[PDB]
Design an enzyme around this catalytic site. Structure first.
Site, PDB file in Angstrom:
ATOM      1  N   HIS A 126      -1.459  16.912 -30.055  1.00  0.00           N
ATOM      2  CA  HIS A 126      -1.772  16.160 -28.856  1.00  0.00           C
ATOM      3  C   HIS A 126      -3.268  16.226 -28.571  1.00  0.00           C
ATOM      4  O   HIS A 126      -3.867  17.306 -28.562  1.00  0.00           O
ATOM      5  CB  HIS A 126      -0.968  16.741 -27.696  1.00  0.00           C
ATOM      6  CG  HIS A 126      -1.227  16.099 -26.374  1.00  0.00           C
ATOM      7  ND1 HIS A 126      -0.649  14.907 -26.001  1.00  0.00           N
ATOM      8  CD2 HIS A 126      -1.951  16.516 -25.309  1.00  0.00           C
ATOM      9  CE1 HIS A 126      -1.025  14.603 -24.770  1.00  0.00           C
ATOM     10  NE2 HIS A 126      -1.812  15.566 -24.326  1.00  0.00           N
ATOM     11  N   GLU A 181       2.824  15.908 -31.297  1.00  0.00           N
ATOM     12  CA  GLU A 181       2.388  15.888 -29.904  1.00  0.00           C
ATOM     13  C   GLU A 181       2.754  17.163 -29.168  1.00  0.00           C
ATOM     14  O   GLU A 181       2.105  17.508 -28.175  1.00  0.00           O
ATOM     15  CB  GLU A 181       3.003  14.693 -29.177  1.00  0.00           C
ATOM     16  CG  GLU A 181       2.594  13.350 -29.726  1.00  0.00           C
ATOM     17  CD  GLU A 181       1.327  12.840 -29.089  1.00  0.00           C
ATOM     18  OE1 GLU A 181       0.847  13.489 -28.130  1.00  0.00           O
ATOM     19  OE2 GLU A 181       0.818  11.790 -29.544  1.00  0.00           O
ATOM     20  N   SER A 220      -2.830  10.407 -22.779  1.00  0.00           N
ATOM     21  CA  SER A 220      -2.024  11.319 -21.966  1.00  0.00           C
ATOM     22  C   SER A 220      -1.801  10.798 -20.548  1.00  0.00           C
ATOM     23  O   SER A 220      -1.230   9.722 -20.354  1.00  0.00           O
ATOM     24  CB  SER A 220      -2.693  12.699 -21.933  1.00  0.00           C
ATOM     25  OG  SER A 220      -1.849  13.677 -21.339  1.00  0.00           O
TER      26      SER A 220
END
Ligand SMILES: *[C@@H]1O[C@H](CO[C@@H]2O[C@@H](C)[C@@H](O)[C@@H](O)[C@@H]2O)[C@@H](O[C@@H]2O[C@H](CO)[C@@H](O)[C@H](O)[C@H]2NC(C)=O)[C@H](O)[C@H]1NC(C)=O
Ligand SMILES: *[C@@H]1O[C@H](CO[C@H]2O[C@@H](C)[C@@H](O)[C@@H](O)[C@@H]2O)[C@@H](O[C@@H]2O[C@H](CO)[C@@H](O)[C@H](O)[C@H]2NC(C)=O)[C@H](O)[C@H]1NC(C)=O
Ligand SMILES: *[C@@H]1O[C@H](CO[C@H]2O[C@@H](C)[C@@H](O)[C@@H](O)[C@@H]2O)[C@@H](O[C@@H]2O[C@H](CO)[C@@H](O)[C@H](O)[C@H]2NC(C)=O)[C@H](O)[C@H]1NC(C)=O
Ligand SMILES: *[C@@H]1O[C@H](CO[C@H]2O[C@@H](C)[C@@H](O)[C@@H](O)[C@@H]2O)[C@@H](O[C@@H]2O[C@H](CO)[C@@H](O)[C@H](O)[C@H]2NC(C)=O)[C@H](O)[C@H]1NC(C)=O
Ligand SMILES: C[NH+](C)CCN(C[C@@H]1CCCN(C2Cc3ccccc3C2)C1)C(=O)c1ccc2cccc(O)c2n1
Ligand SMILES: C[NH+](C)CCN(C[C@@H]1CCCN(C2Cc3ccccc3C2)C1)C(=O)c1ccc2cccc(O)c2n1
Ligand SMILES: C[NH+](C)CCN(C[C@@H]1CCCN(C2Cc3ccccc3C2)C1)C(=O)c1ccc2cccc(O)c2n1
Ligand SMILES: C[NH+](C)CCN(C[C@@H]1CCCN(C2Cc3ccccc3C2)C1)C(=O)c1ccc2cccc(O)c2n1
Ligand SMILES: *[C@@H]1O[C@H](CO)[C@@H](O[C@@H]2O[C@H](CO)[C@@H](O)[C@H](O)[C@H]2NC(C)=O)[C@H](O)[C@H]1NC(C)=O
Ligand SMILES: *[C@@H]1O[C@H](CO[C@H]2O[C@@H](C)[C@@H](O)[C@@H](O)[C@@H]2O)[C@@H](O)[C@H](O)[C@H]1NC(C)=O
Ligand SMILES: *[C@@H]1O[C@H](CO)[C@@H](O)[C@H](O)[C@H]1NC(C)=O
Ligand SMILES: *[C@@H]1O[C@H](CO)[C@@H](O)[C@H](O)[C@H]1NC(C)=O
Ligand SMILES: *[C@@H]1O[C@H](CO)[C@@H](O)[C@H](O)[C@H]1NC(C)=O
Ligand SMILES: *[C@@H]1O[C@H](CO)[C@@H](O)[C@H](O)[C@H]1NC(C)=O
Ligand SMILES: [Cl-]
EC number: 3.1.1.8
Lengths: 527, 527
Positions: free
Chosen positions: B436, B323, B196
């Protein structure tokens, strides 16, 4: 009223309404002499003309064949059973022309599958009226002798020379050559398509010189001559004809004498002895199938195919995601149509003895060894799915890919499809998946009838497939050029591209079942 | 009693039992002076030597950060929340050494993500002991400042220059260069990896000359600087910095004088107004992120990437199948982790207004136009899945694919993965899929702990991934050379090959979400 003057008689057909239009059908036109009595086990005979006008307005006789009585009352297995009356007098064919009568339409000849033992052109899933109305092609399908009456072989002897059912199809092909212009058809734009043993039949027309001038392009759905069940050897056909003769008490020893014996026997007596001609059998047994007769087939088909001895043209080939499941519920331990059918490693091992009965214990271990390398052992379906993959790969998918590679190697466009859509109406349980045979409904456009309980998406998919097949028949390229469709690329030996078919996303993928097909097509033949 | 002599002073670790082996751990080594008082909003100052022994036996404080309290008691959200005290005194790093002490081992430096507002190295899913044990690599992780405390910017002013959390990271990379050989590390074999905001950080270290000598290779998981959220424009940094000083009530004119105020107010007063600093905000809001400062970043990063201005090395890049779902249950109408979130077309149009606030109705129209072309309109989930893909493709997948492409074009080897396995222990509902953040536990080898309720296959997957990651770090090539693994090909701009990662069968595929990413990368920036 519609009469068509064919070169040996007037013929009157019906009118149907289809999606708010008209299609003229001509059901049950005879193309061969009834092969009865002394013409039994012989090639089909020309026809004698008639100034009688013929009423081609009903599906004709299916040819003699044993029937699937395994699940009485089950739509899944009985939909393949014949839906007209059995008879040796069965060499008829049907035609479907659009309305208004077309000027120079492309012709699609369907050749039904089965295992050269069963099948007929009158089954609902082969109804050519949809393709005639939606795509304005002409659909022709024919009945051809199956079982021993179509494929009993005593080599060289013209009283039973083998491949009679193939000369039945071939003769129906010449009929379409001689007559389809009267129906507004183009004899120079003719596509054979077929499934299972019909697909293997289409491939052998590709190899047979007598058929080369009688069609243009070929479509092969779930089958090809190089499949392990599709061609019976010269020695297998001898033992099998003697053993059938013994089992009818016809054991003469003058060769034409033991045939004249069988000509007098009853069709039902022959159908019931047929099963027992080979010792060990499988659900993929084909006891009377195509042979090397030196006439329809001049040599072993795999030699002709490897050495490039076939019609140079376009081919469209494909398979279904689970070709092999259908055969499991006909005699594999732990497998049933009503049971989610989880099996043990030992049941899987027993299944291998069933389907590969002659193979050595080495080969049965090779199969075990290769097909069993999954990751997650804590999941029940491993062995169940394994056997379906084993059977589907060995019998359909890997030969189909092999035919397409060898064909494409001599410079012809080939197109390969992977059909992976499960029918919302599929009578069989869901663990059997996308089954053998159950893409045919979509080729013939059955889901285009909205009052038929198919998904609206199944209407779209079936519309797409019908267009891709019609463009391939007409133009030799099975694309869908208008609705932002995935482009279908050529299949080449190097990169081996194919199109997937489903209602979610249609993908280009390469090298379908690459590891599995290497094991079958390279290693196993040594075994 | 394991003591190592760093260049700043002696440091005391602690033995850990891992899989019948030992791993020596040094948790919470300080690597800069605490950024307190007059050092707040400034680049990290060097650390003064200590005559002492530092006891590196517990995790250090996490940096000040607001905390997710939307699902009290729910492991799914709380597992990302800090698990040590919050403090401006947070510039510490952790080090995991294999036992026996290695001779010249590759070093893996982790950088945690979280939109540059949250995160800490002490989280359970970042535990480096399993990597130190199984692959005998050294693992280092650091805490760096987040939010306005690490990314408040006024360009020029060295009192608040911007990117101070990136300079924290850089200072930790510097510590490894000066000290890791004392622990058995090879300072010439340092792979950065992160997820991330950590992945977008690694990508910025690639573009930043000050960091080029501090590492060797780079791994980027679900993130890159070119993601829409990862860089704050100077126009935004200007407004946002100012708009903060009004929300805390001390707008001034001498620009060094308005920082003197903010350096007085206590942390919680700053954290409390960070959110309102931008008017409208989305769940992907990064109010204080990296900026172009002429120090860490000398120009717009998109320009540097496009014109080859970056460290030339190997990269490993990938994304998860879903995601975008994680962000929907935080303010998208119709969505909740507790119902199956079947939304309707009206709610989808609202979700676009939520996630693309200042985008023309034209832009919101083309999103709706492109993403709704599914076949089966009669599926409930179409809009639920569509919005997840919209948010997933726009914020993570397409920028990552574009970064890998533009990076590979200047001669280096790139490897792209597509992670599509859903953890068997995943606490969020099934419709959110491969969310995610949920490949990290498999990269860090948590499923290798057999005593932890992961499946056996999840152990097998996590092992294969851990080997691939280690091989990339050690040798630049993320292949698994022993257990007949699928070969992982290089990502080239023309072919665009990537490897899927799952428990069923790993495939090589090409051109991921091609039609979607052509929309986001090529067309959408113009609207
Ligand atoms: C799943 O079913 C098969 C076959 O079963 C059919 O349905 C059952 C409900 C039962 O009524 C059977 O008689 C039906 O034929 C089970 O098959 C074994 O199948 C062979 C096949 O002939 C038979 O001889 C064995 O006796 C069967 N064994 C038992 C214990 O019945 C199969 O075992 C079932 N498996 C599961 C997991 O349910
Ligand atoms: C070629 O044919 C013989 C004939 O075998 C008999 O088998 C019956 C099922 C039926 O077809 C009958 O008309 C026929 O005479 C096969 O011999 C059999 O082989 C099996 C296996 O080796 C033996 O177990 C049997 O004893 C034997 N049958 C009998 C009872 O005589 C022979 O196998 C076959 N060759 C092949 C398979 O190519
Ligand atoms: C740059 O900043 C101004 C400041 O807006 C205020 O908004 C509060 C949420 C808070 O940050 C406060 O400190 C600050 O003074 C933005 O002006 C706002 O713009 C919106 C949308 O155009 C208007 O509706 C508001 O009236 C206005 N805020 C007020 C109440 O003054 C401005 O939008 C921003 N520029 C951007 C977004 O780049
Ligand atoms: C799935 O849940 C959402 C969210 O609804 C929340 O509020 C309560 C109804 C509670 O029981 C719990 O289910 C959940 O935390 C429903 O969507 C809508 O949520 C918005 C939020 O602004 C509300 O305005 C709506 O009232 C609410 N819908 C309803 C039914 O009132 C959603 O409907 C539900 N979807 C399903 C059941 O599939
Ligand atoms: C369109 N499909 C093609 C029709 C169905 N089936 C295959 C199924 C599955 C298992 C085998 N039963 C046969 C049904 C039947 C009827 C009379 C005597 C025996 C059997 C078993 C039906 C066939 O017609 C069929 C039959 C034999 C085959 C042999 C080899 C390869 C094949 O594809 C074969 N297909
Ligand atoms: C070709 N059609 C018209 C469309 C249906 N898609 C295309 C896929 C399926 C849904 C997702 N993307 C969109 C592509 C795109 C581009 C920019 C932004 C987002 C997205 C997502 C389109 C098929 O692949 C398909 C599958 C089966 C079919 C069957 C019959 C007829 C068809 O058209 C069939 N089409
Ligand atoms: C490993 N993951 C990365 C950690 C969790 N998450 C992603 C989720 C996504 C949904 C929103 N919750 C929380 C919302 C919230 C509220 C108060 C305090 C913290 C949080 C986060 C976070 C993040 O820390 C995170 C937060 C913001 C991001 C902004 C842009 C891009 C990102 O990846 C972002 N990630
Ligand atoms: C490489 N391994 C050891 C094996 C697991 N297969 C390979 C697939 C799994 C499914 C079955 N075919 C067989 C290939 C083959 C060849 C001849 C005849 C039949 C068949 C079917 C092989 C993986 O793709 C895979 C997937 C995820 C993994 C995760 C971690 C570690 C792994 O090894 C992983 N391997
Ligand atoms: C039907 O189309 C065919 C061709 O597909 C036409 O018949 C022949 O046309 C070709 C041109 O490709 C000529 O080379 C042949 O010589 C023609 N046939 C013969 C026997 O000479 C024909 O134009 C069309 N017939 C129609 C429309 O009735
Ligand atoms: C570090 O701990 C010291 C006492 O605890 C430890 O003492 C060591 C000699 C050894 O026995 C360890 O196993 C013990 O845990 C303490 O006197 C020091 O002050 C501590 N250092 C700092 C910086 O506080
Ligand atoms: C063909 O069918 C029509 C139906 O009207 C009939 O008039 C004609 O006599 C039929 N010819 C036959 C049955 O030989
Ligand atoms: C193309 O799509 C339309 C619906 O938008 C449909 O009516 C038409 O028949 C389709 N054509 C083909 C060849 O699928
Ligand atoms: C470790 O490897 C580097 C190069 O990778 C080398 O220069 C260095 O001397 C080595 N140090 C050791 C083996 O202690
Ligand atoms: C290789 O196979 C062995 C045997 O099961 C296994 O224990 C090991 O984890 C495998 N290695 C990798 C890297 O997957
Ligand atoms: Cl495959």
């Amino acid at each position: 009223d519609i009469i068509i003057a064919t070169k040996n008689g007037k013929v009157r057909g019906m009118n149907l309404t289809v999606f708010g239009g008209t299609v003229t059908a001509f059901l049950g036109i005879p193309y061969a002499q009834p092969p009865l009595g002394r013409l039994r086990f012989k090639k089909p005979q020309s026809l004698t003309k008639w100034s009688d006008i013929w009423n081609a307005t009903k599906y004709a006789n299916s040819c003699c064949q044993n029937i699937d009585q395994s699940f009485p009352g089950f739509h899944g297995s009985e939909m393949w059973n014949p839906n007209t009356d059995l008879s040796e007098d069965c060499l008829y064919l049907n035609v479907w022309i659009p309305a208004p009568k077309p000027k120079n339409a492309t012709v699609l000849i369907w050749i039904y599958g089965g295992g050269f033992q069963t099948g007929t052109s009158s089954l609902h899933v082969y109804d050519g009226k949809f393709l005639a109305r939606v795509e304005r092609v002409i659909v022709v399908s024919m009945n051809y002798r199956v079982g021993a009456l179509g494929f009993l072989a005593l080599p060289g002897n013209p009283e039973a020379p083998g491949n009679m059912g193939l000369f039945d199809q071939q003769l129906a092909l010449q009929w379409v050559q001689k007559n389809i212009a009267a129906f507004g058809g183009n004899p120079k734009s003719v596509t054979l398509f077929g499934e299972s043993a019909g697909a293997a039949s289409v491939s052998l027309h590709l190899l047979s010189p007598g058929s080369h001038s009688l069609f243009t392009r070929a479509i092969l759905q779930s089958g090809s001559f190089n499949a392990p069940w599709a061609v019976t050897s010269l020695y297998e056909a001898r033992n099998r004809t003697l053993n059938l003769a013994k089992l009818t008490g016809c054991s003469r020893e003058n060769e034409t004498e033991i045939i004249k014996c069988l000509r007098n026997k009853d069709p039902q007596e022959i159908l019931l002895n047929e099963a027992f001609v080979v010792p060990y059998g499988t659900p993929l047994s084909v006891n009377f199938g195509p042979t090397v007769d030196g006439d329809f087939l001049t040599d072993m088909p795999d030699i002709l195919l490897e050495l490039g001895q076939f019609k140079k043209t376009q081919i469209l080939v494909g398979v279904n995601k689970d070709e092999g499941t259908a055969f499991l519920v006909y005699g594999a331990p732990g497998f049933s149509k009503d049971n989610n059918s989880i099996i043990t490693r030992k049941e899987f091992q027993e299944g291998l003895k069933i389907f590969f009965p002659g193979v050595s214990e080495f080969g049965k271990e090779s199969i075990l060894f290769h097909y069993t390398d999954w990751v997650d052992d804590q999941r029940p379906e491993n062995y169940r799915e394994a056997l379906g993959d084993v059977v589907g790969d060995y019998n359909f998918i890997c030969p189909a890919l092999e035919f397409t590679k060898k064909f494409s190697e001599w410079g012809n466009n080939a197109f390969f499809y992977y059909f992976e859509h499960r029918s919302s109406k599929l009578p069989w349980p869901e663990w059997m998946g996308v089954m053998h045979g159950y893409e045919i409904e979509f080729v013939f456009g059955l889901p285009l009838e909205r009052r038929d309980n198919y998904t609206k998406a199944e209407e779209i998919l079936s519309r797409s497939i019908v267009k891709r097949w019609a463009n391939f028949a007409k133009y030799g390229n099975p694309n869908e050029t208008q609705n932002n469709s995935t482009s279908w690329p050529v299949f080449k030996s190097t990169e081996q591209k194919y199109l997937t078919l489903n209602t979610e996303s249609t993908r280009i993928m390469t090298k379908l079942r690459a590891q599995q097909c290497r094991f079958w097509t390279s290693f196993f033949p040594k075994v």
